[PDB]
Amino acid sequence: MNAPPAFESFLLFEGEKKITINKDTKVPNACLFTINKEDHTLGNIIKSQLLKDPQVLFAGYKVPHPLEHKIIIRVQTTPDYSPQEAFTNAITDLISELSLLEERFRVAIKDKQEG
Amino acid sequence: MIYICGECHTENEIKSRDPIRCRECGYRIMYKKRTKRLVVFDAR
Amino acid sequence: QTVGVIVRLERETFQVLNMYGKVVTVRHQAVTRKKDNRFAVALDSEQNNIHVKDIVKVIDGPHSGREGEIRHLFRSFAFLHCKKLVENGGMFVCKTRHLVLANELIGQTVRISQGPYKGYIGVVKDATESTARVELHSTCQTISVDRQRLTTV
Amino acid sequence: PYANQPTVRITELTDENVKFIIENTDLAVANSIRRVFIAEVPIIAIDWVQIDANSSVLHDEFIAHRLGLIPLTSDDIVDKLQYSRDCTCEEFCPECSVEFTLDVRCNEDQTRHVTSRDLISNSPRVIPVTSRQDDILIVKLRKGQELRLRAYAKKGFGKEHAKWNPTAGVAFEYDPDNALRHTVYPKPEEWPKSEYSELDEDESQAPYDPNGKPERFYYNVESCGSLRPETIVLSALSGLKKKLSDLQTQLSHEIQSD
Amino acid sequence: MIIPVRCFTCGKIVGNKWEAYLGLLQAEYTEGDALDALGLKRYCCRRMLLAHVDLIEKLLNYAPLE
Ligand SMILES: [Zn+2]
Ligand SMILES: [Zn+2]
Ligand SMILES: [Zn+2]
């Protein structure tokens, strides 16, 4: 009766925005990225890849409610480096790592199949 | 209207204001046939 | 087709003025009570929007020159009451223009053809010009979807 | 440039199983790959059923539910198949769905097993997995009982419904000797060793590693049949990369908007 | 009533294994040996065939209305 549709966990409706950046004024060089229709799958990798950056002073993600589909990633960087640049670099490194992983997986699968 | 008889399972065409009774065996519990309207389920 | 106002009570009948300006004798069961539209708006001869309880003058028709209070309103006729008038206890009817101020989708089976509900079959319980309430055959819910995403089976 | 450089070692590869090891990566990356295995790998499964006749003892939604869980061979077709929502067709077309039909009547005095062999598709590529072991039993019919239905199978992933989950069992583990002490055993001698444990029989745990991090992850991905088990992993890596690419595109739009 | 298509816990196909399980039990297999011979290794899948009650056989004793 009050069952949400199964596509509501991953589909943006009309007028919904995929990612929104809001600079919080508590501390300098900090931003909050609100990503709609995402879950722990992207939040965890983005948080860890930001934690690999020495210029990132804080990297965290959270789901405010499991019944809603929304990820908040708080990124605070050093003053000579922006949180948006940190987020872009983290996504770029994740994409490069996943492409390398996919190519090496294809190579290893061809090695296992051939012998 | 077509009503399937309860025990002999034979279709009976009766009109309105007629008593419910089977033409063949006289059994008087009859069921409606399944509708011809388009029924669709998500396979979930 | 014809409405009226009771102008006199009797033991077994009524005297009722019709919309046309004539008082006829009808019985008690011969009429049914009409849900009064207290909020009807009409146009006079100079496009002033007249209403119930308004003080108006009649400048055309049989009762031209008379002044009364609007009681009941209809398509092109206005029902008035005037305490100076001895006829029908002051009851008379005039034209609205003789005065001066002083769905085909509901019940049809339907298929959502666009959006995230595409392929679902339902029945339109309630429809407007923009959106329609489609009671879905596949779930236990009635969704609200715009009619441009709907095709009729 | 802080990207990992992960390596892959395939230790086992059958028609329903890939056991592999990913080294030199992060725990978050490994877990996100494991989650995409279950929830974000698209396959083809039945999602639209109309039933012209159902005289069986099981009702119509029961039969539709059992039809949705039958896996269909989605190899090399789900990549070139559109989503129904993203398709420009009015109802259904070969660009977004595969049509199945079923028409079984039992006219013999023994029970008729309506199985997945009776599901007939117009696409020769997308067929029930058991039709390519016995067949998946849909319903049993008594004499005089009929099942006649028309289905459409669209593309989707396990985040929407579990019938689009391509995996049976995603075994995932790391640090098999508890060197990182991520779990703390009250009595370590009471605990059995794993398949990947590198300890002798007298030991129960590895010595504690204070500088260690999860750096080697063991997977056993078992396929339900819709995709080959290596195709699940390749499509999972591609799908995670695509999700990150779309997120980077929207992030670039949001950055340039400000 | 009828054997589930999927194991509830993991999603392994157990709907094509009920008749093979009954045939193996008719071949004087123990239930554990029958489950091992069917490839049901996780105990979540083994309880799907072990605990199944085939009520559709009892439902098929009643004559169809048609
Ligand atoms: Zn009869
Ligand atoms: Zn299409
Ligand atoms: Zn299982």
The string of DSSP letters for D69-94 reads TS-B--TTTSTT---TTT--SSS--T
- Distance, in Å, from the CA atom of C20 to the CA atom of C42, rounded to the nearest integer, reads 17
- Distance, in Å, from the CA atom of D115 to the CA atom of D145, rounded to the nearest integer, reads 15
CB-based contact C91:C68 (threshold 8 Å): no
* CA E60 and chain centroid, separation: 17
The range of the structural domain enclosing residue E6 comes to: 1-66
Q: If we measure between CA atoms, which residue out of D234, D245, D224 comes closest to residue D79?
A: D234
Cα angle: C142, vertex C147, C150; to 5 degrees? 80
Domains of chain D plus CATH, in order, are: 1-42+163-258 (3.30.1360.10), 43-162 (2.170.120.12)
Residue holding tokens 């689009």?
A: D164
- The experimental method behind these coordinates is cryo-EM
Residue holding tokens 């000579």?
A: A80
CB-based contact C78:C71 (threshold 8 Å): no
Decide: residue D142, CB within 10 A, 0-12 exposed, 13-18 middle, 19+ buried. buried
Cα angle: D234, vertex D238, D239; to 5 degrees? 115
Cα angle: E4, vertex E10, E16; to 5 degrees? 35
Which candidate from D53, D65, D144 shows the least CB-CB separation from B43?
A: D65
The range of the structural domain enclosing residue B1 comes to: 1-44
Give the residue extent of every domain in chain A. Answer: 1-115
CB-based contact D41:D157 (threshold 8 Å): yes
D6 to each of A95, A112, B11, D22, D218, how far by Cα in Å?
Answer: 13, 18, 70, 6, 13
Strands ordered across the beta sheet of C91-95: C91-95, C77-81, C67-73, C55-58, C99-101
Chain B CA closest to residue C137: B40
The greatest distance separating any two alpha carbons of chain B, rounded to the nearest whole angstrom, comes to 42
C109·B38 Cβ contact <8 A:
yes
- Distance, in Å, from the CA atom of D41 to the CA atom of E40, rounded to the nearest integer, reads 24
Element (H, E) at A76: strand A70-77
Strands D43-54, A30-36: pairing is unpaired
| Beta pairing partners, C14 | C9, C26
A56-62, Cβ contacts within 8 angstroms, sequence gap of 24 or more = A56/A81, A56/A86, A57/A29, A58/A30
Which candidate from C116, C117, C140 shows the least CB-CB separation from A1?
A: C140
D91 labelled as ligand-binding?
yes
CA atoms within 13 A on the CB side of D204: 9
The residues, any chain, with a CB within 8 Å of residue D201's CB and separated by 6 or more, are none
- Distance, in Å, from the CA atom of D46 to the CA atom of C44, rounded to the nearest integer, reads 66
SS (H, E, C) C30-92: CCCCCCCCCCCCEECCCCCEECCCCEEEECCCCCCCCEEEEEEECCCEEEEECCCCCHHHCEE
Residue holding tokens 């198949």?
A: D81
CB-based contact C80:C87 (threshold 8 Å): no
D80 touches chain C (CB under 8 A): no
Chain D CA closest to residue A40: D32
- Distance, in Å, from the CA atom of D137 to the CA atom of D115, rounded to the nearest integer, reads 4
Task: Specify the 3-state DSSP secondary structure of D219.
Answer: strand
- Distance, in Å, from the CA atom of C45 to the CA atom of A89, rounded to the nearest integer, reads 76
- Distance, in Å, from the CA atom of A9 to the CA atom of A35, rounded to the nearest integer, reads 12
Strands D7-14, B11-13: pairing is unpaired
What tokens appear for B5 in the block? 């008889």
- Distance, in Å, from the CA atom of E63 to the CA atom of D55, rounded to the nearest integer, reads 11
Q: Give this entry's resolution in angstroms.
A: 4.1
Cα angle: D224, vertex D225, D229; to 5 degrees? 85
- Distance, in Å, from the CA atom of E29 to the CA atom of D15, rounded to the nearest integer, reads 27
Dist. CA B7 → ligand 1 center (Å): 6
**Number of structural domains found in chain B:** 1
Dist. CA E61 → ligand 1 center (Å): 20
CATH code: domain of residue B6: 2.20.28.30
- Distance, in Å, from the CA atom of A36 to the CA atom of D253, rounded to the nearest integer, reads 15
- Distance, in Å, from the CA atom of D9 to the CA atom of D24, rounded to the nearest integer, reads 12
- Distance, in Å, from the CA atom of E24 to the CA atom of E2, rounded to the nearest integer, reads 18
Element (H, E) at D255: helix D229-257
What tokens appear for C90 in the block? 């002051």
| Chain D residues within an 8 Å CB radius of E11 | 162, 165, 167-168, 224
| Chain C residues within an 8 Å CB radius of D91 | 111, 113, 119, 151
Strands ordered across the beta sheet of D7-14: D7-14, D17-23, D216-223, D167-174
Decide: residue A22, CB within 10 A, 0-12 exposed, 13-18 middle, 19+ buried. exposed
E59 to each of B20, D60, D79, E1, how far by Cα in Å?
Answer: 28, 16, 42, 8
Dist. CA B3 → ligand 1 center (Å): 10
Residue holding tokens 């489609």?
A: C134
Element (H, E) at D167: strand D167-174
Cα angle: D81, vertex D82, D84; to 5 degrees? 130
CB-based contact D121:D132 (threshold 8 Å): no
- Binding-site sequence positions of B for Zn(2+): 5, 8, 22, 24-25, 27
- Distance, in Å, from the CA atom of E29 to the CA atom of C68, rounded to the nearest integer, reads 104
- Chain C touches chain B, with at least 3 Cβ pairs below 8 Å, answer yes
Residue holding tokens 């002999």?
A: B8
Phi then psi dihedrals of residue C117, to 5 deg: -105, 20
Q: What is the rounded end-to-end Cα distance, in angstroms, of chain D?
A: 25
CB-based contact C123:C135 (threshold 8 Å): yes
| Chain C residues within an 8 Å CB radius of B36 | none
What tokens appear for C110 in the block? 């339907």
B6·E65 Cβ contact <8 A:
yes
D91·C116 Cβ contact <8 A:
no
- Distance, in Å, from the CA atom of D121 to the CA atom of D151, rounded to the nearest integer, reads 9
Decide: residue B35, CB within 10 A, 0-12 exposed, 13-18 middle, 19+ buried. exposed
Which candidate from D69, D113, D169 shows the least CB-CB separation from E5?
A: D69
- Distance, in Å, from the CA atom of D10 to the CA atom of D25, rounded to the nearest integer, reads 16
Cβ-Cβ contacts under 8 Å between D and E: the total is 80
Element (H, E) at D11: strand D7-14
Chain D CA closest to residue C139: D61
**Number of structural domains found in chain E:** 1
Q: Which CATH architecture has domain A1-115?
A: 2-Layer Sandwich (3.30)
| Chain C residues within an 8 Å CB radius of B39 | 121, 137
